Each structure stands twice: as structure tokens, then as C-alpha cells.
Amino acid sequence: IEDHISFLEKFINDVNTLTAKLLKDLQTEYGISAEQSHVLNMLSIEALTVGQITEKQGVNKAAVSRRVKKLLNAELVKLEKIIKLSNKGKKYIKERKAIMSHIASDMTSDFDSKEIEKVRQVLEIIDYRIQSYTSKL
Amino acid sequence: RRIEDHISFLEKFINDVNTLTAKLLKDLQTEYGISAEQSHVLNMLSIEALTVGQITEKQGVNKAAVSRRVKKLLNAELVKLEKIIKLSNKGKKYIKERKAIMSHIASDMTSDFDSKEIEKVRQVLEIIDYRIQSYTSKL
Ligand SMILES: COc1cccc(OC)c1C(=O)N[C@@H]1C(=O)N2[C@@H]1SC(C)(C)[C@@H]2C(=O)O
Ligand SMILES: COc1cccc(OC)c1C(=O)N[C@@H]1C(=O)N2[C@@H]1SC(C)(C)[C@@H]2C(=O)O
């Protein structure tokens, strides 16, 4: 009712903590920070402007500016305006999938693939609506 | 390869949840004169009390990039040290207003679902959260 909201928050806080730790080394091997990493996973999904990234995150523009220019200098991202993933950046996102997929299956090897289907359909509709309300405001 | 698709969506889904909250709490954060990251701190202290390390490694961010956020809130009088770190009154009102916003939207975004549907959804996310936590413990 309202603790679904709390749960959701606690669930998201947990996933972030698991991801930070599991991707700890990779990020070090790349010289990329956690701050930057999220931008890379965020761009895996879309080609965004530093503003788009800044609003889709609520943090200080300067901070997003600093991290994007670091990703360019690292050739982990590139230009059109558009800030999209470069191929070296893409391999990180693939080295990231591989590690996520490995632990994810571990924890879901016993689920009913169909139970999950209905659960996913519910989330796609909520997601669909989340994107809808979000446009500006 | 089947899980990869679910993982992508989960990441997208969480991606949007974060995005939405950011747009939805901006004006309230501005009203209280705080940054979003400063809000997370208050939010993380709404569920239970914490110290610096606890938080600094909870979402593993920089060294002196947690400390600064911490003392700022003491000065804003939204948090209290009674290291130790817990929420204050003006901070409790913040979370109040915050939850009110998150509950209207989430409700009216869920209200047409069959409670049984929502409950099933949560039961699945609860078991994943459960398995996540235990994994974290093993590092
Ligand atoms: C637009 O952002 C900036 C503007 C002006 C000066 C800046 O630092 C000199 C930066 C910046 O991003 N500094 C980053 C920081 O912190 N850094 C990096 S560079 C570093 C000093 C080697 C150290 C690290 O990465 O190890
Ligand atoms: C999980 O949020 C993040 C995830 C990953 C990196 C992040 O940047 C450090 C943040 C973040 O700072 N988020 C902002 C913050 O703090 N937040 C907002 S969204 C919120 C979590 C509901 C809470 C609030 O405003 O109530």
C-alpha cells in the first residue's frame, strides 16, 4: 500500500549495493568510477544529451558534465548533442552483462518461467506508465 | 540468454523508477534546500539509523564524498548525530511530504490492478531481494 513503496525502495537499494560490489573490480580495471558506470549502463539503453542524463538523475549538471567528458577522454563514450557508447564502452557493458547474468541465473534457476512472465507483464505496464507520467512536469 | 532480457528490463525498470522520483521530488528538495543525494541520505535513515561507513559502502561512493553530505544536513537541521547519525524533526516532515507524493502517484498508477496481481509481483521481488541480500553477505 505504502510499504510496497518502501519495499520497492529497499529492493532498489539492495540491487545497487549488490551491483556496486560485483562490479567493483571491473570498474577499477577500467579506471571508471561508480558514478560513471551508471552513466554507461544508462546509455546502453539510450543515446542521451548531458542534460537528458542530468534530468533522468536529478544530480548537479556540473557533476554529469565532469563524468561525461571523462568518458569521452576515455573513449568509453562518444558524440552524435548525442552522448552514445563507443565500442570500448560497449565491451564494459558486455563484461557487465556476463557477470550479472551469471549471478542472476544462480538465484532464479528454480523459478517458474511462467510465473515470472505474468510478473513481468505487470511490471511492463507499470514501467509503461512510469515513463508516461514522467514526461516533463 | 532468457534471463538477459529480464535483467535488461529490471535495469530499465529501476532506471525509470529513479528517473521518476527525481523529477517528482526536485521541487520538494529545492523547497527544503537539498540535493537529491542528500535526500538519499535522509531516505536511507528513514528505514533505519546508520553511521558513515554503513552508508558510504551501502551504495559505495567516494571517501570524503559522503562526509560532506552528512554535515550539510546537520546544519540544515534535518538530521541529528544523537559516528551515529539519525533523522531530526524537520527531516521527518520532509520524508512525510516525500512519501505522500510517492504514495499518490504509485497508488493511482497501481489502483486498477487486482490486489492479487500486485501481491504476486511483490512476493517474487521479495524472494529475489531475499536472495540478493544473502549473496551480498558472502560479498
Ligand atoms: C571537469 O572536472 C575537472 C575540472 C577541473 C579540474 C579537475 O581535476 C583536476 C576536474 C576533474 O574532473 N578532476 C577529476 C578528479 O577528481 N580527479 C579527476 S582528474 C585527477 C586530478 C587526476 C583526479 C583523478 O581522476 O584521479
Ligand atoms: C537510488 O538512487 C540512486 C541510485 C544510484 C545512484 C544515485 O546517485 C548517487 C542515486 C541517487 O542519488 N538518487 C537520488 C537520491 O539520493 N535519492 C534520489 S532517488 C531516491 C533513491 C528515491 C532518493 C530520493 O530522492 O528519495
In the structure, which protein residues have their CB atom closer than 6 angstroms to any atom of ligand 2? A 12, 16, 38, 58; B 18, 21-22, 25, 36-37, 39-40, 43
Name the closest ligand to CA B23: 2
Interchain pair B22, A101: CB under 8 A: no
What are the backbone dihedrals phi and psi of residue B34, each rounded to the nearest 5 degrees, phi first?
-135, 160
Specify the residue for cell string 525509470.
B16
For residue A84, give the DSSP letter.
Answer: E
Signed CA dihedral, A118, A120, A122, A124: sign only = negative
Q: With beta carbons under 8 A apart, name residues in chain B contacting A123.
A: 9, 13, 121
Q: Look up the CATH number of the domain holding residue B94.
A: 1.10.10.10
Tally the domains of chain B. Answer: 1
Q: How many interchain CB pairs under 8 A, A with B?
A: 148
From the list A18, A7, A38, the residue with the least C-alpha distance to A100 is A18
**Would you say A13 and B44 are in contact if contact means Cβ atoms under 8 Å apart?**
yes
Pairing of β A83-85 and β B79-80: unpaired
Of A5, A12, A18, the CB nearest to B99: A5
Q: With beta carbons under 8 A apart, name residues in chain A contacting B14.
A: 12, 15
Q: In units of Å, what resolution does this entry have?
A: 2.8
Q: Can you give the residue range of the structural domain that contains B84? A: 1-139
Cell of B45: 535513515
Query: d(Cα A6, Cα A24) in Å, to the nearest integer?
Result: 27
Q: Which residues contact A110 (CB under 8 A, 6 or more apart)?
A: none
Cell of B44: 536511507
Solved with: X-ray
